[PDB]
Amino acid sequence: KPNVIVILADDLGFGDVSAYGSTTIHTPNIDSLARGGVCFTNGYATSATSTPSRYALMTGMYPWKNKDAKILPGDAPLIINESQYTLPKMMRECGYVTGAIGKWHLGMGNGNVNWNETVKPGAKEIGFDYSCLIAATNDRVPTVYVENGDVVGRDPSDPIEVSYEQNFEGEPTAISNPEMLKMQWAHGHNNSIVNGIPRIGYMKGGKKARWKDEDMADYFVDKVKNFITEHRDSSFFLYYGLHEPHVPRAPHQRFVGKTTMGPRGDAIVEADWCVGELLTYLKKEGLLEKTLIIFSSDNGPVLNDGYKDGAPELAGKHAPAGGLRGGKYSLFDGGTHIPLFVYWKGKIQPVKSDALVCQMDLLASLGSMVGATLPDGLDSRNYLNAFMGTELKARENLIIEAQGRLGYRSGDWIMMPPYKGSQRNLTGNELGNLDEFSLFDVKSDKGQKSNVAGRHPELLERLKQEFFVQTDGFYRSEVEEEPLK
Ligand SMILES: O=S(=O)(O)OC[C@H]1O[C@@H](O)[C@H](O)[C@@H](O)[C@H]1O
Ligand SMILES: [Ca+2]
């Protein structure tokens, strides 16, 4: 029973840490988990977007088995059943105090959230004893903190209303009042304005509750330190959802100019500082040697994701997906293949593993560690030994997902079905919409340059058979292209 901390960054690409040898960014605090722990070269989220990757981590279920597991608005209902087995529920029944701090994006309420009372079901009802959260994303209304289902700084004399349907009569928008903007929108992100930054969706009221983006990193770090100190004498499971480098990239003043890459780079150094502050505080509390730390990212990277923040102009030679094709929103490997480090000081011996592992496996793997009785019916597989770096093999195969489109990794091979859709979305990311069943040897062709399906017809038919069996009932040959907000 060590403490367990799952740290998720938000769109942090395979090439957005220096752990794998990048010359174009420096993430020393994050790299210390990688070098001093298990550094996974073949670590995966299930999905190339937030809500589905986070759903798979929390439930141990493939998210494409839930029709609601896609990018959620801030007023979306909770997509996990109140009765369903979850990572925090398991840890709690095995003697842990549970906390979720930072990004949520799994939904809250039952479709008519009153932001002025306790919002249920939420984190509390899926097994987090403590929560202090962003409902959806830092670019989505409501721009407030939700602590155990209550909006921080709410006020009956300035009540909060949210709509993703239309503006509140009388309320300024990015379009009505462009003079109020300190950051320009590039596409979407042109509804309500908060702290000079235009957002997705419309918000009225709660002047007191409205967050300040530049102090968000510090506010969650302080909630994390409060949680650790409150529970230092107990076994705790903390889910720490960093907002960086998700748009808007408005990091604290002290991080501005730390990089050559504008707000995007500066937000990554902000996240690295949060990780450094966590490690420092664990050392201070004397907990480092009894705390298992898992660091990862919900999905692959993106430069321009809706704001004129200089990300494409100032990227220079920086390859955020570190040589992988695509990125956020892509069915190519850069969508799901993310940094993944597992660290336990004095227990795990430093290792670089090529084991095919997925965030979805943490529920069954941690379950094995703490002696859980798992229900039947989870996708989550027990690979505890691979996660501890004791064994260098885990999965033979993994399904990957990009906004409802599915593909297949099996050993050194990726099979992508063909899908009708755009080559790129407005971000410039390649979506992985190909015209034929394609096959990539990712041992030799890391960057998925070449569809070699033609010279491997036997292997292709087999990978198609296995993919159809695992996805039947969920796989859709035609998937609606969801517009960026
Ligand atoms: O990391 S995620 O939460 O999946 O990102 C969600 C994205 O949704 C898109 O509609 C917006 O254009 C992006 O700016 C971003 O907010
Ligand atoms: Ca994300």
343 and 227 together in one domain? yes
Q: Among the three residues 353, 388, 423, which one is the final residue of a domain in this structure?
A: 388
429 and 304 together in one domain? no
Helix (H) or strand (E) holding 292: strand 291-297
Nearest Cα residue to atom 16 of ligand 1: 139
Non-local CB neighbours of 98 within 8 Å, separated by 6+ positions: 88, 91, 92, 127, 128, 129, 130, 236, 237, 239
The structure was resolved to a resolution in Å of 1.8
34 and 153 together in one domain? yes
What CATH number does the domain containing 433 carry?
3.30.1120.10
Q: How far is the CA of 463 from the centre of ligand 1 (A)?
A: 31
Q: Among the three residues 356, 388, 420, which one is the final residue of a domain in this structure?
A: 388
Kindly state if the Cβ of 266 falls inside 6 Å of ligand 1.
no
Kindly state if the Cβ of 137 falls inside 6 Å of ligand 1.
yes
Angle between helix 262-285 and helix 216-230 axes, rounded to 10 deg: 20
Nearest Cα residue to atom 3 of ligand 1: 50
288 and 427 together in one domain? no
Strands (E), 166-267: 193-194, 197-198, 202-204, 236-241
135 and 264 together in one domain? yes
Closest C-alpha among 429, 434, 472, 438 to residue 457: 438
215 and 306 together in one domain? yes
312 falls within a domain:
yes
341 and 429 together in one domain? no
Binding-site positions for Ca(2+): 10-11, 298-299
Going from the C-alpha of 190 to that of each of 176, 200, 483, the distances in angstroms are 10, 7, 14
124 and 240 together in one domain? yes
Residue 8, beta-bridge partner list: 241, 296
Name the experiment that determined this structure: X-ray
Atom of ligand 1 nearest to the CA of 299: 1
* Dihedral angle sign, alpha carbons of residues 246, 252, 258, 261: positive
233 and 322 together in one domain? yes
As for how many domains the chain has, the answer is 2
Residue 342, beta-bridge partner list: 38, 294
Q: How far is the CA of 258 from the centre of ligand 2 (A)?
A: 23
Kindly state if the Cβ of 459 falls inside 6 Å of ligand 1.
no
Phi, psi of 178 (to 5 degrees): -60, -20
Kindly state if the Cβ of 244 falls inside 6 Å of ligand 1.
no
Helix (H) or strand (E) holding 151: strand 150-151
Measured CA to CA, the distance from residue 120 to residue 138 in angstroms comes to 21
Copy the structure tokens of residue 437.
């069943």
Copy the structure tokens of residue 155.
């006020």
SS3 295: strand
216 falls within a domain:
yes
Residue 467 domain boundaries: 397-471
Binding-site positions: 10-11, 298-299
Residue with tokens 């956020």: 328
Copy the structure tokens of residue 386.
């691979």
Give me the count of residues in the chain. 485
Measured CA to CA, the distance from residue 309 to residue 49 in angstroms comes to 21
User: Are 320 and 75 in contact, with CB atoms under 8 Å apart?
Assistant: no
Strands (E), 298-451: 340-343, 351-353, 357-358, 397-402, 405-410, 413-416, 438-441
